[PDB]
Design a binder for this molecule. Structure first.
Ligand SMILES: O=C([C@@H]1C[C@H](N2CCN(c3cc(C(F)(F)F)nc4ccccc34)CC2)CN1)N1CCSC1
Ligand SMILES: O=C([C@@H]1C[C@H](N2CCN(c3cc(C(F)(F)F)nc4ccccc34)CC2)CN1)N1CCSC1
Ligand SMILES: *[C@@H]1O[C@H](CO)[C@@H](O[C@@H]2O[C@H](CO)[C@@H](O)[C@H](O)[C@H]2NC(C)=O)[C@H](O)[C@H]1NC(C)=O
Ligand SMILES: *[C@@H]1O[C@H](CO)[C@@H](O[C@@H]2O[C@H](CO)[C@@H](O)[C@H](O)[C@H]2NC(C)=O)[C@H](O)[C@H]1NC(C)=O
Ligand SMILES: *[C@@H]1O[C@H](CO)[C@@H](O[C@@H]2O[C@H](CO)[C@@H](O)[C@H](O)[C@H]2NC(C)=O)[C@H](O)[C@H]1NC(C)=O
Ligand SMILES: *[C@@H]1O[C@H](CO)[C@@H](O[C@@H]2O[C@H](CO)[C@@H](O)[C@H](O)[C@H]2NC(C)=O)[C@H](O)[C@H]1NC(C)=O
Ligand SMILES: *[C@@H]1O[C@H](CO)[C@@H](O[C@@H]2O[C@H](CO)[C@@H](O)[C@H](O)[C@H]2NC(C)=O)[C@H](O)[C@H]1NC(C)=O
Ligand SMILES: *[C@@H]1O[C@H](CO)[C@@H](O)[C@H](O)[C@H]1NC(C)=O
Ligand SMILES: *[C@@H]1O[C@H](CO)[C@@H](O)[C@H](O)[C@H]1NC(C)=O
Ligand SMILES: *[C@@H]1O[C@H](CO)[C@@H](O)[C@H](O)[C@H]1NC(C)=O
Ligand SMILES: *[C@@H]1O[C@H](CO)[C@@H](O)[C@H](O)[C@H]1NC(C)=O
Ligand SMILES: *[C@@H]1O[C@H](CO)[C@@H](O)[C@H](O)[C@H]1NC(C)=O
Ligand SMILES: *[C@@H]1O[C@H](CO)[C@@H](O)[C@H](O)[C@H]1NC(C)=O
Ligand SMILES: *[C@@H]1O[C@H](CO)[C@@H](O)[C@H](O)[C@H]1NC(C)=O
Lengths: 729, 729
């Protein structure tokens, strides 16, 4: 073979680019798609298009447009510019509204600058936005706003938006407002961070900044004071009739009010029925209320006969939180993924006023998500196919006959496609399938009426051609047996892989609770280069604590982070040695985030298995990480709860053992998530026992170390480190 | 040669210690010397001693005693404990006073905890101390203290102590209190930092600290708002229990009050005469006031006819600040080191009420300091001897006949001893000479009347014996000529140095204004180990900007930091690389603090001379460093003054040029002096141009990186880096 390899520069410079097909459904029949900067509208049934918005229309706008969104009625477009990222989901921007009829910009009563969130109503063209921590509503795009809240206060009171921990850990979103289905009501949460302690760290900014700024963020670490929450619903139809429309509070159940709790789900069921899920700070007890608008009293009442309890004896509730309900049209019943009697997550069907649900799926595999629901069918994604927990397929279950389950994606191309997600049109008339591996991504359109393939949207044939002329690595996905249990692993294997030879191995680690690092996804990444160019086998293993394989495995680390998931990585590397193609003198380990923690714990174990390793932005001590995530698995760091294990599971306590390995420690100085503190404490502990190691800080980079320059820099630095570690002198 | 070399562990574990002889003169005849925790009193004439304080007298004290301070009359001893370090000189402590005649601790009216500064009066046993930024006086150690100031406010108003910049850059002391010679009056300064911006940075503390704390220090960077100053004198003999003490203000001269200024010297001339020097923020103009107490008015009057102006056309005033005056017994005249018409610093004799002074010394060499003054002789240290700038000897000049200058140390032992300092007894009847190289330190005692060498106090005989068992490096001190100017260098040369072999060379740099890195001092340091064990030549060079050779050289970098001192290091290395015994493929550079700046500027020069280098806590951009030091050399960073050169002299602008060198960048995260910011901006600039480098932060270490464990870790890591840089294929 004399083809070039996939090199570091190929990775860093995006030589071989995966083609996507990102569409946005605007109705049951049409979607928007961007072609040469034009936004086209496509007819799903026939595949024909027209130009929805010419790439030239905003040449003289005066700013770069970061994103857009069309009002559901297609009458207006929201233009987003001046994008300034905040945390993982949050950002601020400027907004203009463009009238698609008059084909003109709206110049009056503009959405203000530094707006924190904006959303169209689900029908028509009402807008709700949050600015300086208060909610505002515009019935019409050109008319004055109605103020909804007056309590907003920077870093203290948040109306309609989440604080740091709710954004990161509870909602995975910045917005905390929820329009009712036809847009009459606006529901929202209000967060109060008054007594939440602040994390503080320096931000250096451009070199022109003479004094560094101190960034200050309300952030509860494990066992600290949490934000408190309240929930309100306002009738937006009353706004133009009343001076100051009342926000009606819906209070949490008595079973939540006894202690610290969270609001963890808000889902509208009908025009006049809302469901809310609450979670106790000890995250093994959750309560769903189902609340009806009382038209005579103007209030929202939650009948206790409609209250649903969800609890767990072996772990926490949900994968990362209680699952969302999917209501039938009439709002009298719902489906929900919950853990069955054998510990497998399956769809349960509830009547809103009956406490026992009926499971509609079962087996030793799990439902991943419910994707659409029509009067006749529920569509869901699972890992059932071929008993492969790292595969994903779309299924269709007949609501009038649960024995009728059709796999819609399994057989479409079984060699190329074992991992699917899906995007349904507005009332599920059409669906886009996204195949993401093990072959090249493939995007296809389908009609729900007959489940017929309409067309291939994107097959990545250009890329397939380019890759022919490259010595690509291959991927092996398989399992090993420990204590009568299957544990899955993957290997990125060098091209021309020869089982008779001995290769250096890099164990690529995440291993957090419900993680999955062994799967059928096609990836072009650093491991691609390491296998292709450096002849390194890059392996990953899903041990105890990993997800999508039932609660027995997932909850094995309950209250005991930093134990089995760490040991099982070491055991995996031993098993890979036994396999006879691994150079036992050249086994390395690396990971980012939770993976940095595990890497560090492994390097500090004294196992003798690993020559060297790299931790990027690691957790080092559970008391340093946020409350919601940490306590879910660890409970509270108090003498009476779990303090002893909090104190027993730190990186720092294993400092002496790092004498036996080569360690590289890396962290961004402006990481708001895993604070630089965490690595600062590892380095100090290594200094204190006289261990030499390598270190790199990334000025002003956060948890993603994702700026273009820092990304290239970190992977270049890590490559040098691995090459040196593995070099035969 | 089977002798051991001087190893890294030898340096790190202090295997070979220099013996000292630290004495404290208590009168014209006697000194105190700490010996095995016992404090002995010695008679200078005979060399006999008695015990003044047994090592066991405080066996039952309950605390480890940091330090001792015996009152001038020998009646009391101040006991210092609970020492908590603050900045370079500042710290807080607790104090008890032990009555030497009652043989008991004083338990009534104790000095409070967290006392910031304490000092005995110069005669007797009064005390002045600062606590919570206010001054208190105790007339007797068991009596209630009088409160002198009431305006003390943390981080804002400082009475009798310095703020950060005055401590670091003006006074080199935390103390801002000055007793009159017999203790009648107590003069003090008051600093007001109201509008001085704060540097803020994180401190991580022990692992147990859940949230890092933010340190906030009022610290004026270049061009920022400076602290303001006021000066006061209080009569301590007329204090009342009933009414508040009255402090008399002495205001600065009009030529100072017109703009920003500093108080830079306070020196009592007589019991009733005090001199003050003030310096403009533009530090090329200073003025001395000489002020007399008016018994009639109780006021202090500074006659204009007694005002002395000192300015510079080529640079700033004084070496690091205007020099201190040395008054005669009657206070009617004084001697002061000032730059003469050739730019050489010599002793000038002033009459208090005449503008012209008379130079009493002259020549192409410099007086370093005035050490003692009697009616017949002034005693000073200079580098006159053998025309060697890096040598120091003690001289005396006959005040009746300036042609009569006698060297008192030059010929004592010219081979061993070329660098002296001196300590005189109260009326200059005796002196202790401290020889510090080129041979082993030698401490001797002398009587002034006929300059007899009375006795050897400490000759390091023991260490000499040990060192003969070790392959010690030698030192060459010599010069090169640049533009017909002599510039001095030193080389630490490996044992068995062979001029025909080729050695790698490490250039050890400081190169700050008035620095001197080429001298005759004997050192046991990191360089000793590099030469002795690793066979590396360690060179240092004193180029333009360096000290003790006149203003032509010293002021060559005026308004132009990061130019000629940087170029001259490159030029010296260039010249060294053309010597037969130097391997031009293995020349490295390193420096700390100002030396780290210069190392970085050199590595970023694109000279091609250096393979690698290490910068420890470097300055990177002059706008980040403090006002008093920076502006002394650079003026103000405004377009009207010197901003263009502030902007041209940064490390960050040279980032691209690092592509051809190996660089190690190191910095303590709690550096209050050269902020971590400075290195954070270097790393970000290197990342931005895609340059790979090595880095190390030191959690919670300051500018000295001097904790036992951090000191060992840094030197270990640097040694690995150099060894790797110098390893041959
Ligand atoms: O940053 C963090 C944590 C992780 C935590 N993540 C964990 C992964 N997580 C989730 C991942 C995925 C996947 F993958 F299926 F799509 N799906 C989710 C679906 C619903 C909710 C959460 C999901 C989203 C939130 C947020 N902060 N650290 C935790 C310890 S080390 C640093
Ligand atoms: O830390 C600093 C600066 C240096 C500055 N130093 C410079 C050296 N300096 C001085 C050194 C010496 C020597 F030599 F005779 F002993 N003697 C002095 C006699 C009187 C006053 C100052 C002196 C004491 C003050 C304090 N902060 N940086 C400057 C730029 S990089 C970091
Ligand atoms: C809309 O009604 C709210 C609710 O009463 C008003 O907010 C209150 O204002 C008073 C006085 O300023 C405060 O003491 C209360 O604490 C506020 N309550 C809340 C929930 O914010 C608000 O001012 C009204 N807006 C207008 C324009 O009248
Ligand atoms: C959206 O749903 C809301 C809530 O049901 C509707 O508002 C109600 O409309 C009915 C008319 O059939 C009235 O009986 C009630 O007085 C209304 N209730 C409230 C709270 O306003 C609303 O009409 C629906 N909107 C649209 C556009 O269909
Ligand atoms: C320390 O300095 C500040 C000025 O920096 C003084 O505060 C000023 O005092 C004047 C007169 O009383 C006021 O009119 C100003 O408003 C103050 N200025 C600022 C910026 O606050 C303060 O009095 C000084 N303190 C002492 C003890 O001298
Ligand atoms: C220290 O010197 C001061 C200042 O000269 C002395 O105080 C003066 O002493 C004279 C002579 O007795 C008095 O007449 C003056 O009125 C005093 N002046 C002031 C301002 O107090 C003081 O006595 C001396 N102290 C010692 C211990 O010698
Ligand atoms: C102190 O230094 C400043 C700055 O170099 C000198 O001010 C300069 O003086 C002349 C005019 O007399 C011009 O070259 C510049 O316009 C001035 N520069 C600035 C920045 O103002 C000043 O003369 C020096 N003082 C002394 C006594 O030498
Ligand atoms: C697609 O084709 C049909 C004609 O058969 C037409 O009615 C429809 O408007 C077209 N859609 C677009 C988006 O061009
Ligand atoms: C705009 O659209 C046309 C295709 O109709 C294309 O030629 C052009 O590249 C697009 N982008 C521009 C002009 O920036
Ligand atoms: C937020 O909580 C604090 C209690 O710590 C309370 O004083 C304050 O009024 C609350 N503000 C609200 C709910 O707007
Ligand atoms: C929730 O967790 C705590 C700690 O494990 C436990 O004491 C409590 O009983 C748990 N609840 C359930 C339902 O198991
Ligand atoms: C030293 O000896 C003399 C007598 O020769 C005596 O007066 C003096 O006190 C002694 N000094 C000390 C400090 O022991
Ligand atoms: C200093 O602290 C100790 C311990 O708290 C206390 O007992 C003592 O009285 C304090 N000293 C003074 C002078 O206040
Ligand atoms: C002295 O001055 C301070 C404030 O300036 C005052 O509080 C105190 O009472 C005064 N004491 C006397 C005795 O006048």
């Amino acid at each position: 073979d004399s083809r070039k390899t996939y090199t570091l520069t190929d990775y860093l410079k995006n030589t071989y680019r995966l083609k996507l097909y990102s569409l946005r459904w605007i109705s049951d029949h049409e979607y928007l798609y961007k072609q040469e900067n034009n936004i086209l509208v496509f007819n799903a049934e026939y595949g024909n298009s027209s130009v929805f918005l010419e790439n030239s229309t905003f040449d003289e706008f005066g700013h770069s447009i970061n994103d857009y969104s069309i009002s559901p009625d297609g009458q207006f477009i929201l233009l987003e510019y001046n994008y300034v990222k905040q945390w993982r989901h949050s950002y601020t921007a400027s907004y203009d509204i463009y009238d698609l009829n008059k084909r003109q910009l709206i110049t009056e009563e503009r959405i203000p600058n530094n707006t924190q969130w904006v959303t169209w109503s689900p029908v028509g063209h009402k807008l709700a936005y949050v600015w300086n921590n208060d909610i505002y509503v515009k019935i019409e795009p050109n008319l004055p706003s109605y103020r909804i809240t007056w309590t907003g206060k920077e870093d203290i009171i948040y109306n309609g938006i989440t604080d740091w921990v709710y954004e990161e850990e509870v909602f995975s979103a910045y917005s905390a407002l929820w329009w009712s289905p036809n847009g009459t009501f606006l529901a929202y949460a209000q967060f109060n961070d008054t007594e939440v302690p602040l994390i503080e760290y320096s931000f250096y900014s451009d070199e022109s900044l003479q004094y560094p700024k101190t960034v200050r963020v309300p952030y509860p670490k494990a066992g600290a004071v949490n934000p408190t929450v309240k929930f309100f619903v306002v009738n937006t139809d009353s706004l133009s009739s009343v001076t100051n429309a009342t926000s009606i509070q819906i209070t949490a159940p008595a079973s939540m009010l006894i202690g610290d709790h969270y609001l963890c789900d808000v889902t509208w069921a009908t025009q006049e029925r809302i469901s809310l899920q609450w979670l106790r700070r000890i995250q093994n007890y959750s309560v769903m209320d189902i609340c009806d608008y009382d038209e005579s009293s103007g209030r929202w009442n939650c009948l206790v006969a409609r209250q649903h309890i969800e609890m767990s004896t072996t772990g926490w509730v949900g994968r990362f939180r209680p699952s969302e309900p999917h209501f039938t049209l009439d709002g009298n019943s719902f489906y929900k993924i919950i853990s069955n009697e054998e510990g497998y997550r399956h769809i349960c069907y509830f009547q809103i006023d009956k406490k026992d649900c009926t499971f509609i799926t079962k087996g030793t595999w799990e439902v991943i998500g419910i994707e659409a629901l029509t009067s006749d069918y529920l569509y869901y994604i699972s890992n059932e196919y071929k008993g492969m927990p790292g595969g994903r397929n779309l299924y269709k279950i007949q609501l009038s006959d649960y024995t009728k389950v059709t796999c819609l994606s399994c057989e479409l191309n079984p060699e190329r496609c074992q991992y699917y997600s899906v995007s349904f049109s507005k009332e599920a008339k059409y669906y886009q399938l996204r195949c993401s591996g093990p072959g090249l991504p493939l995007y296809t359109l389908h009609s729900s009426v007959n489940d017929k393939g309409l067309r291939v949207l994107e097959d990545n044939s250009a890329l397939d051609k380019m890759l022919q002329n490259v010595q690509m690595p291959s991927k092996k996905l398989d399992f090993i047996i420990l204590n009568e249990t299957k544990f899955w692993y993957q290997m990125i294997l060098p091209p021309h892989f020869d089982k008779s030879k001995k290769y250096p191995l890099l164990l690529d680690v995440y291993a957090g609770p419900c993680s999955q690092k062994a799967d059928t996804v096609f990836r072009l990444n650093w491991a691609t280069y390491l296998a292709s160019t450096e002849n390194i086998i890059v392996a990953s293993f899903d041990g105890r604590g990993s997800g999508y394989q039932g609660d027995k495995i997932m909850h094995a680390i309950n209250r005991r982070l930093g134990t089995f998931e760490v040991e099982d990585q070491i055991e995996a590397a031993r098993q890979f040695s036994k396999m006879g193609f691994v150079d036992n003198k050249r086994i390395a380990i690396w990971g980012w985030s939770y993976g940095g923690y595990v890497t560090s714990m492994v390097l500090g174990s004294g196992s003798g298995v690993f020559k060297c390793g790299i931790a990027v932005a690691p957790v080092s001590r559970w008391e340093y990480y946020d409350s919601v995530y940490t306590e879910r698995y660890m409970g509270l760091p108090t003498p009476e709860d779990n303090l002893d294990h909090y104190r027993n599971s730190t990186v720092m306590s294993r400092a002496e053992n790092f004498k036996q390995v080569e360690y590289l420690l890396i962290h961004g100085t402006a990481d708001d998530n895993v604070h630089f503190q965490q690595s600062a404490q590892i380095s100090k502990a290594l200094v204190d026992v006289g261990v030499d190691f390598q270190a790199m800080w990334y000025t002003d980079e956060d948890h993603g170390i994702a700026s273009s320059t820092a990304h290239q820099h970190i992977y270049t630095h890590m490559s040098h480190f691995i090459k040196q570690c593995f070099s035969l002198p």
